[PDB]
Design an enzyme around this catalytic site. Structure first.
Site, PDB file in Angstrom:
ATOM      1  N   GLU A 156      11.257  -2.999  11.350  1.00 27.70           N
ATOM      2  CA  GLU A 156      10.140  -3.025  10.370  1.00 27.70           C
ATOM      3  C   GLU A 156       8.998  -2.140  10.905  1.00 27.70           C
ATOM      4  OE1 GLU A 156       9.982  -3.731   7.290  1.00 27.70           O
ATOM      5  OE2 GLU A 156       7.792  -3.347   7.271  1.00 27.70           O
ATOM      6  N   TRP A 157       9.297  -0.865  11.099  1.00 26.32           N
ATOM      7  CA  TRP A 157       8.285   0.192  11.348  1.00 26.32           C
ATOM      8  C   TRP A 157       7.361  -0.218  12.501  1.00 26.32           C
ATOM      9  CZ3 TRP A 157      10.713   3.956   9.546  1.00 26.32           C
ATOM     10  CH2 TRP A 157      11.424   3.894   8.338  1.00 26.32           C
ATOM     11  N   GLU A 167       7.900   5.286  -1.556  1.00 26.97           N
ATOM     12  CA  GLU A 167       6.525   4.868  -1.154  1.00 26.97           C
ATOM     13  C   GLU A 167       5.716   6.049  -0.596  1.00 26.97           C
ATOM     14  OE1 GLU A 167       7.311   0.091  -0.343  1.00 26.97           O
ATOM     15  OE2 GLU A 167       7.177   1.406   1.400  1.00 26.97           O
ATOM     16  N   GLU A 222      12.423  -2.677  -4.421  1.00 29.58           N
ATOM     17  CA  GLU A 222      12.214  -3.583  -3.274  1.00 29.58           C
ATOM     18  C   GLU A 222      11.403  -4.797  -3.733  1.00 29.58           C
ATOM     19  OE1 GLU A 222      11.887  -0.130   0.291  1.00 29.58           O
ATOM     20  OE2 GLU A 222      10.521  -1.928   0.301  1.00 29.58           O
ATOM     21  N   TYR A 239       5.376  -6.513  -3.483  1.00 31.75           N
ATOM     22  CA  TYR A 239       5.328  -7.626  -2.529  1.00 31.75           C
ATOM     23  C   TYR A 239       4.173  -8.574  -2.797  1.00 31.75           C
ATOM     24  CZ  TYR A 239       8.901  -5.088   0.106  1.00 31.75           C
ATOM     25  OH  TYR A 239      10.081  -4.517   0.512  1.00 31.75           O
TER      26      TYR A 239
END
Ligand code: NA
Ligand code: NA
Ligand code: NA
Length: 444
Positions: free
Chosen positions: A405-406, A163, A351, A294
């Site tokens: 999650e970041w 990414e 993903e 996503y």
């Protein structure tokens, strides 16, 4: 007879800083994310990856859990700060973790897919300018060459970057991700230095002529729809598509940045990093493309400011991220790549997955029926792409387990396995049991 062939890879995915913990063990030094998560207001409730899922210590239990699900391939990332904790200083103890992990995967019939860079840049590299400093191409090249030479007998499937849109625009323009700058010109130069670094690893990889080994890159892609058939919304959708998708697809697969976006960006910042020699290195032939998918975006013209499209809510079901559940875009993006960019090249979904409000009920189970239905709808689109002549080789669910999650910290749960962080207990969610059945029957 089988919807998914015996050779199709059913996978799961993680990333080093999101699951490993052991942040200060066996010679690991800080990454930009260890630093960023300690800056006030950057991460939800000052969460960090000091401990995460403790996967560094629990990796054998985690591999056995994957073997029991019937997982065929495991995508993970290698932590640069474990391998080179200081510039030019190799750490064999760091490499030893990835040898024991990959040894455990191969002995349990799980194919390793290793992401070389998933955002955990060493703090020493950032302090020298990080992705803004073109010398990073050589530091990344040295790191990649060491992984290929030490792990080439363990790993035959390599991903340079995860990414690059996130490492560039989300990290340097929007400022949500480490190191959190807010400057379009910096984000554009970083996007270039990331792609050049990818190129350098590919050049090294081809020179090694590694037996039965493949290299690719992972991109987060969406589909952009205009809110209406107006010319205004058409241009808004074109820019939003250029920003997320074509800015990366075009240099990689056409050897040229998208000219509409070069001109658009050029009104607001410098685009003088573009040159022929660099685009030749960036566009070297790959063995596969990893797609991270996503959601879609429905957009309408905003106030004619810099990338200021208004996000339309079309009124459909969403995940806890606020992301529309729109499985058709998975098929649409894979077909777009087959028709416009990758043609007959192998594709992986590296993903796909969803965050829901998961709770452990009094029966000790996690009845995540929304995640079961989410995965079912998206696998059905993968099957449709295969049945329409698509070259899809595998599908990695994000994520094996709930993790860091970041900027959201531990507040968003993407796992097919629930993690109780107080005990580090793993609980299979109903989505994991559904996936185990899909791998076993190969039917949906
Ligand atoms: Na961690
Ligand atoms: Na913190
Ligand atoms: Na290619």
């Amino acid at each position: 007879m089988l919807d998914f062939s015996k050779d199709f890879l059913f996978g799961v995915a993680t990333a080093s800083y999101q699951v490993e913990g052991a942040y200060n063990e066996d010679g690991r030094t800080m990454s930009i994310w260890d630093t960023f998560s300690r800056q006030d207001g950057k991460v939800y409730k000052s969460h960090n990856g000091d401990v995460a899922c403790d996967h560094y210590h629990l990796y054998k239990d985690d591999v056995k859990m994957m073997k029991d699900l019937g997982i065929e391939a495991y995508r993970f990332s290698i932590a640069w700060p474990r391998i080179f904790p200081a510039k030019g200083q190799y750490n064999p103890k760091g490499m030893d973790f990835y040898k024991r992990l990959t040894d455990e995967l191969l002995k349990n019939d799980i194919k390793p897919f290793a992401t070389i860079y998933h955002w955990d840049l060493p703090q020493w590299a950032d302090d020298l300018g990080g992705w803004l400093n073109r010398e990073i191409v050589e530091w990344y090249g040295e790191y990649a060459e060491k992984l290929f030479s030490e792990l080439g007998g363990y790993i035959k499937n390599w991903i340079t970057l995860n990414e690059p849109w996130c490492s560039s625009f989300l990290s340097y323009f929007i400022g949500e991700h480490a190191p959190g700058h807010k400057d379009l010109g910096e984000a554009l130069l970083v996007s270039h230095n990331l792609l050049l670094s990818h190129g350098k690893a590919v050049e090294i990889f081809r020179g090694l002529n590694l037996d039965d080994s493949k290299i690719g890159i992972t991109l987060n892609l969406n589909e952009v729809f205009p809110a209406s058939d107006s010319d205004d919304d058409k241009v808004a959708a074109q820019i939003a598509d250029g920003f997320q998708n074509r800015w990366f697809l075009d240099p990689l697969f056409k050897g040229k940045y998208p000219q509409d976006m070069v001109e658009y960006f050029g009104k607001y910042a410098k685009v003088d990093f573009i040159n022929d020699e660099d685009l030749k290195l960036i566009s070297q032939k790959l063995d596969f493309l990893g797609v991270n998918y996503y959601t879609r975006a429905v957009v309408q013209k905003g106030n004619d400011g810099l990338l200021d499209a208004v996000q339309i809510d079309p009124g459909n079901e969403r995940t806890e991220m606020g992301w529309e559940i729109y499985p058709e875009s998975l098929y649409n993006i894979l077909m777009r790549l087959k028709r416009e960019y990758t043609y007959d090249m192998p594709l992986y979904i590296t993903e796909n997955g969803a965050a829901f409000n998961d709770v452990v009920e009094d029966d000790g189970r996690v009845h995540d029926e929304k995640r079961v239905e989410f995965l079912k709808q998206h696998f059905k689109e993968a099957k449709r792409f295969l049945n329409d002549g698509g070259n899809l080789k595998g599908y990695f669910v994000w994520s094996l387990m709930d993790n860091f999650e970041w900027a959201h910290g531990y507040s968003k749960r993407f796992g097919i396995v629930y993690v109780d962080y107080e005990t580090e207990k793993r609980i299979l969610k109903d989505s994991a049991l559904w996936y185990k059945d899909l791998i076993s029957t190969r039917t949906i």
